[model samples]
Every structure is written in C-alpha cells, then in structure tokens.
Target: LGKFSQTCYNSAIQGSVLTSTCERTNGGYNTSSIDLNSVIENVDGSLKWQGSNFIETCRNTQLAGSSELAAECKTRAQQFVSTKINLDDHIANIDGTLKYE
Candidate 1:
C-alpha cells in the first residue's frame, strides 16, 4: 500500500466518517475497516442509532433526542458498512506501465 492507501486505511480506527475505505495504489489495492466504536462514547446511554441497511426495520429515531443505539445496531452497522464499500473500485484492471498513460 502506498501513502494514499495507507492513509485511507489508517482512518479506520474510531470516530472516522468512513467505516471502511481503500484506494488503488501504485502497488496494489488496500482496504481497511474503521472502528466506529471508538467514536461512539462508551458512557451510559451515550450513543445514537446507526440504522440498518439490512433487516429493513432498523431505523434511527434521532431527531430531537440522543439515545443509545439498539442492540441490533451492530448487526445492521456491519451489514451497512459491508455494503457501503465498493471493492470493485479497488481492484486494479491495469497498472505499472498501463493506464497512467
């Protein structure tokens, strides 16, 4: 992984806007998983709902109040993050002496 890929991967620890991010570096593709748990406060009831991209019924009810995320939020969050990252983009079709032209 090059600087770009490393940097992209480095942000995958706590409180990052991107759950998982990667970049196609000159060498190869690099992907990383950001730990959003660090961003979520561990204190009592100091969290917000991260709605599910799966399950269909998971919705965050944060419009006026700050509450803890539902138990299912982890399942949904993982599903959501998994779908959010487009691995295809990171896969290199051509590199080295190609495409850069």
Candidate 2:
C-alpha cells in the first residue's frame, strides 16, 4: 500500500525512495521508522508489518482479534506514523524543540 527506505533490508518488491507512507515525529523521523524498518512480514500477500514484527505477532497471536491485540496495534501505529514526515521539516522541528527552554 506504501513504500519504505532502501536501507531497510526488508522492503517492497518495487524498492524504496527518500519518502514513504509512514510519517516522522522527531527530528530524524525514525523512532517509528526503525520500528517499522526493523522487521518485515508477508501478510497474506497484502501489506504486512514494516518495522517490527508487530502485526505478524498479532496475526498469529492466539489472543489475536481480541481487544487487547487491537489496542496494541493502535499503540504501535500511533508510535510508528511519525517517521513519514519530510526530513527537512523534521530536522527543523527538532531544532526548534531543542531551542525551546
């Protein structure tokens, strides 16, 4: 459904570019990115987990489809969506935050 970084070993079959679907939170835009880039799983030939083996684990979790698992996914998604922001803006924002006193 989206793209990932080339540096990430596990990526889309079409390869990656400078940007992707996920957004960035911090200056570097990777806190969530790495979590997504860290792991890749093939989900029924559809879009699966990108960074951590989160979705995979959930899909296979005996407790999957449960509210607990749903909540976990939501938390993970919230934590991971910030890495998609443009690097330039991300860096600037971080710089500003650092300047805050």
Candidate lDDT (C-alpha), each: 0.48, 0.42
Q: After superposition, how far is residue 63 of candidate 2 from its true place, in Å?
A: 8.1
Candidate 1 structure lDDT? 0.48
- How many residue pairs of model 2 clash at the backbone? 15
Error of 2 at 18 (Å): 9.3
Choose the strongest candidate by TM-score. Answer: 2
Q: Which residue pairs collide in model 1, if any?
A: 12-34
Q: List candidate 2 stretches off by more than 4 Å.
A: 1-38, 50-74, 79-101
RMSD of each: 11.7, 12.1
Q: Cα RMSD (Å) between model 1 and the true structure? A: 11.7
Task: Give one digit per residue, the lDDT tens place, for model 2 in 40-59.
Answer: 55678976765545665444
State the displacement of the C-alpha of residue 13, model 2, in Å, after optimal TM-score superposition: 8.4
Cα distance off (Å), candidate 2, residue 57: 9.9
Compare the candidates by lDDT and give the number of the best one: 1
